[PDB]
Amino acid sequence: TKLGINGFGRIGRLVFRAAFGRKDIEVVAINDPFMDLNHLCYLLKYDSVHGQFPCEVTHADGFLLIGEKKVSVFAEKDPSQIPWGKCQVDVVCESTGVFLTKELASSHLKGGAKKVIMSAPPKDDTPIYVMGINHHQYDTKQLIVSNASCTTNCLAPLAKVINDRFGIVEGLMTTVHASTANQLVVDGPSKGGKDWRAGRCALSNIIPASTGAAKAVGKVLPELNGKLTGVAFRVPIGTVSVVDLVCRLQKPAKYEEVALEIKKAAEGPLKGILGYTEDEVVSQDFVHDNRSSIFDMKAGLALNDNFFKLVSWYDNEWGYSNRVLDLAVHITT
């Protein structure tokens, strides 16, 4: 399984990183035009949140070197001009943040790539998949797909398990989200005039933000269509975010029973995707945690037999980056 990476940013680089540890998938090419090979290597060797790269990194003959493996590096603004074909790339991890329609992402297909995974929710009707939730509903005919957002990957397993046993009538979600590259260090104009709040100083603000993440749950779980939505607060934190789902349940239950059901899934049919802790955890405890969702039993509570607050952690960078690789293997195999 040969992977290509378009946009060697936080997601691009950590996807590269997770892929090094996996035997079944291999990175063969990278593209980023805001980055010379000298600069690119620097940014990969050092990382402020996840530590240094697990082995030596040099460049040679326009390639990137990780032991006995060469990796092509390109610097093209236009995806139609990236030579994926010559590297026999099976899947392109589209992680720039600006090619989020079927039309724009199909430019990768023109360059010789077989299939594409947007590392974000699409702006159009592109099919969305969450590993562990609806990934088996994929078929090889779909060449361009989305792996949703980190928040959707955190929310979907939690909702699926609660909905199958108890039945979610309606739910509203809040995610307290770690910092992202779309934000600014000092009050300034946000990109293209959209989302003014995200241009406000990241270091000292709680910043309200819209998200479709919870509304997207209805795409990967049709049954919950129109039954979920939410908002986000961005806060000055390196990585790790948390979802807080307030939902009303059809079948009544104590909080103890809800927790045990989530424990059952995390230990059985959702091992590796959904996790369960009863510890007094805080955000830094999930730095570099590869799961999509870790239910925090003690943070949440119940108002009554039918109204619950359910709390789940996620490393927005690491968890998600591992899911891109899982999906990339799945669609190719």
Place this chain on the structure above:
Amino acid sequence: TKLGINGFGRIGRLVFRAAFGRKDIEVVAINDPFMDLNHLCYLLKYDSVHGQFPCEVTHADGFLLIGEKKVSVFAEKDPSQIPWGKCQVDVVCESTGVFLTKELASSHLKGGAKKVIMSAPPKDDTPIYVMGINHHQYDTKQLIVSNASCTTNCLAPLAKVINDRFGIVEGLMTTVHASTANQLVVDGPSKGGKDWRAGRCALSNIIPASTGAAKAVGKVLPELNGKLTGVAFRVPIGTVSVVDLVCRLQKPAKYEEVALEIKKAAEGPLKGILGYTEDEVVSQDFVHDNRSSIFDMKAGLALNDNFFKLVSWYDNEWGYSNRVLDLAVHITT
């Protein structure tokens, strides 16, 4: 109205500051045994969040000097030993955090103080009052009372207005809360071994926390008893906190109607307590805002006609501090 301050902390010093800009109330006496007079002045003079004290601040003969006015300074650990009576104190602002029961707080009365306000939720059944909400129900025969928490002061006005018109069936609250003095700069043991998470690094964590702030709305508004509770996440922010109320209503509404109902309350009955904004605000926009609650119209949303997320901001330090003075004025006059 002659005020005394026990515990010259974040609340004590900002209570002193607010009272400096009011003619109807003045601080005559201060007690803090963990603070010598030179130290006290220094801490009053400078402030990391709210700037330098708007005044020449000095001391002489054991008195604090704010312009042409002398303030009495004490340093007893036992409140019983503070000569409040000789300073002719009408109300004592109990802002130490360690005298939150009617038995402990009554020693101020034994020191001569006529009345006491607990600047926090009580640990017993001491009466709780929130300006704008139930302060007219105060009986002068009550010598010791509590002004609740900053979070309750934010949530109750919001909940009141919404419940008066639409009726709240149930509700769960999250507050994303700024930093407080019970937290630690690096990972350590929390005082008494209680609330382990709050001992974790304040600078780099999202920290789950319990709170009775929502349950206690039921005390100030009996009609909502058993219908509200919540949780909190602490974040590395200087001041300003935000409440997210997910509530289910009986009378259906569009989001715009709910917003309008809050607007008219804010410009009418609850003017000065509850505020309204449709601007793209972030937390630092409410530093030194003296309102108890500021509804953020564009940050909230509705899922359907009976299920809402309503967002409100508060300067947990400065808002609450002015509330302590309005309650001090009320229970005296």
Place this chain on the structure above:
Amino acid sequence: TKLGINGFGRIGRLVFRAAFGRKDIEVVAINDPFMDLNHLCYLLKYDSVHGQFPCEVTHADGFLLIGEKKVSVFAEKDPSQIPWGKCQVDVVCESTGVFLTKELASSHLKGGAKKVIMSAPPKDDTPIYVMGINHHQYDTKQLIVSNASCTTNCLAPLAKVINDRFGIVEGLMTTVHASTANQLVVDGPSKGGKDWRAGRCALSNIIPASTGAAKAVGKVLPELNGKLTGVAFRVPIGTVSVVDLVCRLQKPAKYEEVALEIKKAAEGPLKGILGYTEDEVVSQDFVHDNRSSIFDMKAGLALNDNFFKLVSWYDNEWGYSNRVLDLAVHITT
């Protein structure tokens, strides 16, 4: 004195705000093409550091409205086209960061501006001035000038006084610097690929940075040319930076005497530019302090009678912005 502003960023907007107060200078025109008018009002009305604009900000018919005062707003990329002459502009504040040569800035003269001040050090041999130091050496024939950097404005007053009285033989400088717009919220590529370190996450890092600011003190004080240089460390701080000057003196001295000579200057001829304190201050105490440099007596020390560490604070945004105005007024009168 009619001022125009090119680039409405941190320095652009803060010059604007500084000017609003003063009765001897006024902003008549603004230009910034990465900013729609509605968005410009938003950035002007709210500030994460210096609080809400002390006045109603609106717009109508393409004009910025401050109360009832109309300010003209353009969105041009070629300063030649900005109609400065139409607005009778005496000085243009060049605060984009990308017109720092004589060739580039002189497009403002062809647009009708009478003179230009660069809000940064120049790339070429454009004359540099610092108020209090060498501003009297400016002659009216010079149409394009520079106000240097915030750091140079901090150091040069301190440098002049120490060298005037004692004689600086050599010296080296570290500034610990607040965060600036050239930095990123998460690890990424810095612009143009210059200074890889500045692209590293700003929230969690101490980031070494080059600075010519200390070498630039030679150009404003020829006598010290070759005898000073230094480096910088960027830290997660909103505003306020500190200079730390290690230096050797020709004539020997005690720390007290050095300190008293700075006190004499700060309360005498350099009043308003160089300040002095013996208080136990921290960076937040100089937020919105309009002086160029404030010497911190207790923070510095001597090793011997010829070798000293001298410490001085500066709000790198506010002090500098006010300096820009002083220069503008000076060069016009």
Place this chain on the structure above:
Amino acid sequence: TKLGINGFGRIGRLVFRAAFGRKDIEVVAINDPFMDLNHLCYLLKYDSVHGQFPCEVTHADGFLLIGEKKVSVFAEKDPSQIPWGKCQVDVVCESTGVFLTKELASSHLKGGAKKVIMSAPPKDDTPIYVMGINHHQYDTKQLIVSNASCTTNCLAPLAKVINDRFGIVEGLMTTVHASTANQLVVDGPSKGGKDWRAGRCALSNIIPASTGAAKAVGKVLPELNGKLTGVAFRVPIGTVSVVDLVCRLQKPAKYEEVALEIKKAAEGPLKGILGYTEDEVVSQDFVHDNRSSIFDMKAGLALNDNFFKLVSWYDNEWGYSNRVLDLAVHITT
């Protein structure tokens, strides 16, 4: 070597951790009365900076269990009451911060411990030892020693190398120091009324601080007595600090040569203690680096052939904790 730990804080817990990977040293007993067993397991297991403990941490029958190995846990305020003798403790890591005196530390010897290491500079005459610089001078008859400060362990190796080769005429230091447990989350009164600035908000401030770490280098390298001193600035950073030495040299040198000397020291006699890099590094890159000092070639510079600014990083927590073990093993074998 059987190690005991009094004070299970940042240094205590990370000393425990480093030992877990060392065969030449083992922890048999811990004392910390501010933290019961359930709480102590939590703090060991989770770490906000260095990640989770790399092992299952549990407890039974009053013992801390790291796998099969049982560790005794006392809760004793009076260090003379700890029964170190019953556990055959060779060395006590005295890392509480409140027993920095021969007389006070010697109460560990009454408990049965053979020897004691102060994890900090002493308040009295106690012998200081930096590994790699002066440790070989230790005599087995000295039962109580100090391992100096993180800052001194960073500057000493550098100063040694520079002085041996070029001759340090005089020097002044500045350290930018990561956050420490003596600071406060919000403006407050520091312990004992000492160091007022350390009580100011850790999250939002650059905070000046005194330090004898530079002067103490003259104690471990007598040739440098009276030639070094300096100051510190605290910044909102989890761990990793930097030293900035401005020094005059007796023999003139090109900066390239000064770097080359440090390189061969780091690859030869000071391998493991003193490090060297030419990479564009930032503070986060040295998290969990076990060296005491990492020279940063590109950060520093020279003013002339005699006057240099030399820059070096250190993980104040992890580097130091590793040196405590080295000293413990050395004073026992």
